[PDB]
Symmetry: D2
Subunit: 364 residues, 4 copies
């Protein structure tokens, strides 16, 4: 009944019953004879149509807690292009604890069915993924997980709860790196987890309380605050994304463009069926690493950084920053060419962002 | 050369080189084109005479990261009376990851030698322990761990770096629940870890960065701030502890008293050899749970809570709060009688704390 | 060259040169052997096209400092419908210091010329004013002040720098209650002042430093943060304002509507000449205090409060809250009828806010 | 009944009734459908045995509000050696509002009686004063003010409420630059005012609310926190002060020493009658500005700054920093010789501070 933008302002419990304060008090305290974190947990639960919310000290900490739902010998399926925090955690930490990991191209859901082993207990899916924005069918993944008794998990960071709600599609657990869009201001490191399953929430509550990766009260407050403008920020970002893609597809100096809004993008129709907007992450190819380096230097409004989901627009070259550790020829196979540029669209004026990127591409 | 109280004010790096600010700026930020946490990490490193410091979102998170130095199949020795956060984490979480735990009465260091298995990799010691304040020989434990290739760890929370420095006794890793004395004001949840071993610090840095239980910048700031008065607070606490114990030992309504300052306490001489002060935690017996309940109600300045290391004095009954989950007859065996009271001495006036507790014991 | 939404993200200095942090560090410090406030001062200077910015602990403190530019015996002209903080400060505080105040209906600028005395030194104008949203000709006021040697001041709170820039119209000093739209989240009390005049800025700097109504560093940080979304928030608010007014003008239970967007509003053409958007404050008449009380109880999304510029929509009855101290018959003369309702439009969904207010008016 | 150190922990209301939190929540909020500041106001009221407390954004703001209790034409008496913030505010701001100021050497209370005019309304006294630590008889000043119908005010910053309580001596209003000892950590700018007079408190409440120099909630929280250790900090400071003075009085390179603990200091007996400890500010003479410059460079633990009341020990030369604006020959008359050094004793080890300053004086 509440339209989305209204729910962001009035959903969850973010006021103080004791005094009537319209914002949640910051409970910088360790002993009662934490309500600020509880407030942010109720916000993420409401936004994702879940029953239970959990706030961790980082997105990495959220993923670590969810993975610890498993035991030694259990097996997890993940989409084949997981990298960064999540890939390194699973393969360099949790495999030392007997957790077995298999990477599977989930863009075809029957790949999931083939990879299911007797010891499989979890299916973990990012959609869209980083950096090429591969799309996985959430609803079909949920059905497969239910039929085989797997805990289903979606990393919903890139879409945010404003545009995609995996719990409504039958997923067990939805999680976020709230460091990105949710906080939205490049000033809180946090992770968020929501579920509707009472037994899974109890196990999460136990894991959290026993490994202690909790989000502090000041960060909880800044996170609730940033979420208030989530809808306004993603809608501005979405307007710029559409215009930017039109420009990129027309520009001579640009080759392939990667974004789920493009009709020829693999599983474009799947993305439109499970989401009503788009992420602000876009990847596209210029000629080579030298053109990529020239493009970055020629923009006025794009800031060179690896982050995403800021109010400012960000630009990076995956092959030189996030993926420079993979050998070159393997980068080629996976599509991370030397001319691949990734942008995170911010909330600057749309025309300013279109024209700035275009005049910079014109110097190529 | 710097006496202790001076080192608390001038040790580590807690100023801003850029502006000259005499306190560390709070870097509420997620992207650089964290210095507040680095400042608290350099403080704990300096205070413990270590090379490397690490700040976690809770003491529990610090212990979790240290335990993750191990692999499935590895074995850890801990002192037999570990409980609370640490016991539950090891036995209900990490055993699910193949970490094997053995509890050993380390008050006799030869018990450690008997319990060493081919798969043992870590020795973890609290001293003094909770709630009966058992003392373990740190220096001898370090030698045993070195001789058998074990990573040695001391939980140094109860003593603080002001009075006991395990790294100076050959221990590999020292850790704290900074929630207690270090922050000292019941308003920061944090854990701290220090080591001098370069390879162990790298593995800790990797574990921290991959499981993400980091301490936020605002909490880092309040922790540095609270540590400034650590010496003044522990010395006031120590003056009150000595006077309180004199009173308790003389009072008819009091039976056994548990504190390492008492000459008949087991390993009293060991504690004086490895520390130059005392914890503010004291346990003592009254007749029974009813006398314990009456005593708490009769004090004016002791506050009923399970916490410790606050500026206010705290009081609790272990058998009814922290240990009420253990069966009664097992509580009897371990010494947690129904009349066992535990206090955490604060920084109120010493005479006020002595007389208040004595007039309350007089109502028994 | 920078369009507005871009300037909100990249104007002023809000990064750290020392570390590259993309947000301003919070300098919780009192001694250097304040940069967070300086950052917010540079933001307000940039947004208003001024040279110098000043941050005070409240909008009231900003007005107090500006008034102290004068001496005993000096005279100030203000618009006739000033009330609340500003009216009480001038008439109950500064008149005790020999500052003389004359209230003048500035909607006709020739009233200003008639009221100028030999001792007049300042012209102070709110536009639009509260609660009936009277509009004053800023440019003509500036010319009059320049011709008669008066310091010109505009309270630009209701419009924000996003829509109206008095410094560009020749005004000497522009000021804000940043508590409202600029912070935008009902969680910072602050005032902001900008000027381009070097000598006036020096006198302001001296007054501030000598009476000490400074904005703290944490509040400075939250203010900079909230300003990042100012453009997105005011544009959403403006979309809802236009639709709401259409609904109000059509509804049988509504009489007069007060808002500068209405073509018959006095000085409507003046407002469009000096601003390119609208405030989110709207006043309108229902039958009587009972209908007003029923309307408030019948809305789902409007929150009863006296504040304005929040993310949530607010509703109030001036005759019962802000102006209940003026005698009834005087309230009638000035237009503050018992059925006068004032709303502050928030950033909820526009349709939700239109339909909610309409179904509530339908219960009348 | 509560001894001092106990009252610092349990006086005033610094807990949350709603949740039981043992620290005051930080109410970062502007609207209720401020409790953090109220908590710090109740602390200063309790510590000074007053009924009403007021928290301002700076000590300067506290003095400004107290001065605004007066009207144009009213006259204020102050001690002859007021300088810095207070002197500049009164003479460069409030005289422009018709407030008349007379500086009077209050070390002889009969000077006050001679200076009383028909228009005198306020007596304002710092004791001890800066930088030569002149002592004024508080009790006799209060009697004179009562007999002549004057509002009596004491700036109690240098002594803190831990050692001197002017309200108990009949003074109307006591005030502090809480930036110094009360916060104690060089990280809060704040002023505090306490009174027991209901009518004066109402006028202060009105002035505060109308000129808006309020202390923010985060600063209020850090101030309450710092006050918890006030007693431990001042007692450590006092131990070092006594030892340092013994050293200074014995050292060949040192001439006059200025501190109220010295038996030959003017009004030494008065200070002991109205206070039970000492300020940590000490002034002493070396030969000349060159010796002063050499001394500062030769210390290891004294930090060059103009501040006072930090945890670190501070050192400065008044004639080159705070008073370099007064002509040289006038500085000579008032005693601010070129060799005058001022120190603010911190909480480092006493022996470290004695020996460090002595080895530095030995280089002279």
């Amino acid at each position: 009944s509440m339209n989305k933008k209204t729910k962001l302002i009035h959903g969850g419990h973010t006021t103080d019953d004791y005094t009537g304060a319209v914002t949640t008090p910051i409970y910088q305290t360790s002993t009662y004879l934490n309500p600020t974190r509880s407030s942010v947990e109720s916000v993420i639960a409401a936004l994702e149509n879940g029953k239970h919310g959990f706030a961790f000290s980082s997105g990495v900490a959220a993923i670590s807690a969810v993975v610890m739902l498993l035991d030694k010998g259990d097996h997890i399926i993940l989409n084949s292009d997981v990298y960064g925090g999540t890939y390194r955690a699973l393969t360099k930490v949790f495999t030392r604890f007997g957790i077995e990991v298999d990477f599977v191209d989930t863009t075809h859901t029957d790949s999931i069915v083939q990879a299911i082993r007797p010891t499989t207990k979890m299916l973990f899916i990012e959609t869209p993924s980083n950096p090429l924005l591969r799309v996985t069918d959430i609803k079909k993944s949920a059905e497969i997980a239910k039929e085989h008794g797997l805990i289903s998990v979606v990393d919903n960071t890139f879409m945010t709860p404003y545009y995609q709600n995996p719990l409504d599609l039958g997923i067990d657990i939805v999680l976020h790196s709230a460091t990105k869009y949710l906080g939205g201001h490049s000033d809180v490191v946090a992770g968020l987890v929501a579920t509707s399953d009472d037994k899974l929430a109890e196990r999460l509550a136990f894991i959290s309380n026993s490994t202690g990766g909790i989000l502090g009260p000041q960060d909880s407050y800044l996170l609730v605050r940033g979420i208030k403008t989530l809808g306004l920020r993603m809608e501005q970002i979405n307007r710029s994304v559409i215009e930017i893609i039109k420009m990129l597809q027309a520009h001579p100096a640009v080759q392939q463009v990667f974004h789920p809004s493009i009709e020829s993008h693999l599983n474009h129709d799947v993305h439109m069926a499970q989401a009503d907007g788009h992420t602000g992450v876009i990847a596209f190819e210029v000629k080579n690493t030298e053109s990529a380096k020239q493009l970055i230097k020629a923009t006025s409004y794009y800031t060179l950084a690896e982050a995403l989901g800021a109010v400012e627009s960000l630009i990076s070259v995956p092959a030189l920053m996030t993926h420079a550790s993979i050998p070159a020829d393997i980068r080629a196979k996976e599509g991370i060419t030397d001319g691949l540029v990734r942008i995170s669209v911010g909330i600057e004026d749309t025309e300013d962002l279109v024209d700035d990127l275009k005049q910079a591409l014109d110097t190529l």
